[PDB]
Design an enzyme around this catalytic site. Sequence first.
Site, PDB file in Angstrom:
ATOM      1  N   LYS B  50      34.280  22.450 -11.754  1.00 59.62           N
ATOM      2  CA  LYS B  50      33.181  21.566 -11.371  1.00 59.62           C
ATOM      3  C   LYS B  50      32.979  20.428 -12.367  1.00 59.62           C
ATOM      4  O   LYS B  50      32.367  19.421 -12.018  1.00 59.62           O
ATOM      5  CB  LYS B  50      31.870  22.341 -11.189  1.00 59.62           C
ATOM      6  N   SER B 248      35.655  34.226  -7.927  1.00 58.96           N
ATOM      7  CA  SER B 248      36.498  33.332  -7.143  1.00 58.96           C
ATOM      8  C   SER B 248      37.956  33.391  -7.574  1.00 58.96           C
ATOM      9  O   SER B 248      38.844  33.457  -6.726  1.00 58.96           O
ATOM     10  CB  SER B 248      35.990  31.911  -7.202  1.00 58.96           C
TER      11      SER B 248
HETATM   12 CL   LIG Z   1      36.424  31.941 -11.116  1.00 63.53          CL
END
Ligand SMILES: [Cl-]
Lengths: 304, 306
Positions: B50, B248
């Site tokens: 990000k 993730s």
């Molecule tokens: Cl991650």
Amino acid sequence: APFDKSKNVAQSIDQLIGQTPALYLNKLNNTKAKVVLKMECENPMASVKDRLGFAIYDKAEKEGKLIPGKSIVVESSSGNTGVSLAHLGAIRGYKVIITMPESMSLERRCLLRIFGAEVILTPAALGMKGAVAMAKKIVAANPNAVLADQFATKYNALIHEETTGPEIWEQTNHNVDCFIAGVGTGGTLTGVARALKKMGSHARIVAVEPTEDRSLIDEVLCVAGDDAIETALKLTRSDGVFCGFSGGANVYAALKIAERPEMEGKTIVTVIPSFGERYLSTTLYRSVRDEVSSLPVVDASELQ
Amino acid sequence: AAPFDKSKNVAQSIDQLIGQTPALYLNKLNNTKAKVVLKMECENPMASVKDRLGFAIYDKAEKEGKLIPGKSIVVESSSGNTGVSLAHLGAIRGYKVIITMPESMSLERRCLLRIFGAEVILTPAALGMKGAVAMAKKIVAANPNAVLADQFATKYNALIHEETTGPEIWEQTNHNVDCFIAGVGTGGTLTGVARALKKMGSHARIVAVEPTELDRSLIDEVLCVAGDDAIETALKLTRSDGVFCGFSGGANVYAALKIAERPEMEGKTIVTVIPSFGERYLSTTLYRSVRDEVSSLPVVDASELQ
Ligand SMILES: [Cl-]
Ligand SMILES: [Cl-]
Ligand SMILES: [Cl-]
């Protein structure tokens, strides 16, 4: 050439150790000197100690003194040296045993155990001396076990002379007037000083001694704990550098040195040893934690 | 471009250290006949992919004249890694940043945002995300210099991964990508990397990872990954390969290992993403199995050391 990690795929995460970035201090630096931060926080396990971990495994294997799958690596450290030894031990197939006082945080235990290190807890009352005792005791008891500390002593300055120092030299365009780092064990100070001397640098070498024996050192600067702590919080908000206590001390020292008239236009280099996130739940960032823990909540009546 | 050689120069800003992340072959955990490449976004300066989006928001919005340094107030109704990146990069650019977030979000998230000097505003648990959004709206309605950041996250997310992440993977793999795998849901590399690959003429298989327990032509296959599998994989990965990531990343690696066992993937190159470093999650349920283990450890008796 050193592995070009920005352009090729690495075979192992240890190839990502070192070759860290360097960053000018901008907003926090209101002097006429330049301050360069060697960003060791950007190592794969978030500290300069990744270099020492790698050096221990790499050099001791090459000497025939560590054998993957036979040697059991024993270390009496809570901090980042233990983390790196656990990390790199896992991937090289060594059993790693870390002794630490029971008083160290769950987080610290957790970091080590994620890599599969065996974490042995010693009485709080005996502190770190007790962890050392336990480590010495585990090693005497197993001929296959080795104290990692002997390797740290042997290789720490060398790895920094071979890697960190040459990187700084190239990054700064062969232009260093002052190098600053901590007096602590397991840091860059001695090795980088040796590299700079050998390159023909006339950089002044400053050891930072926090308030909370070498012919290479030109000057020791004592830095109060509260100044280190305050600097770390300012650094995040001024320049986006998020580090630990050591880095805040180093930057305080650098800014002090930077205010000297003779340093006008000169390049001061210092080190950010570790990333700050590891310390979020420690005293270093307590002021911030205490603040957000008692914020008001907007009333639901205002939200329509 | 003139891409910054950070191993060889001094950066003027920490923004220059964003991107150009390493790529790493999975070794011990990969028992297949396929190659699995991990794009190590965990190695960004604030430890997540990000950071690329935070950078894109400031860079692109400033060029559009929609963020003015020293004047705009950045208002962000999220406390995740995008929020962190906005607070982090806003500080250094001289913007005030406001985060609206439910009171029920973790104390650790509040702390990290406040580290960067963001103003953290809490909204009632019962109203969830919608109350944080309503509070952000209220701020912006009262001050024309305050700007909602989420509009920019939407506009630029896929674009920055098309422009940077995707081309980096293409170069790192020497134009040899047979499959690219990444998570569903916004904030992802999936759309932008897939677009980059297709522009380059790659016919790599694109696999979307969907955790359980454009957004059409781009996806060849959806792979459902159970949360328990994602969690177990994250802990295996640390021990096998020394890669320490979040949920993730564990899901992506699980998915990649499933694709790698497909017979037609023998000898092929599969690329996936490790979005974030694992340390941020040490206080969360992702590593609770490890916290519970270490919290019950015995302590050696002083008698043994004496
Ligand atoms: Cl991650
Ligand atoms: Cl150091
Ligand atoms: Cl530090």
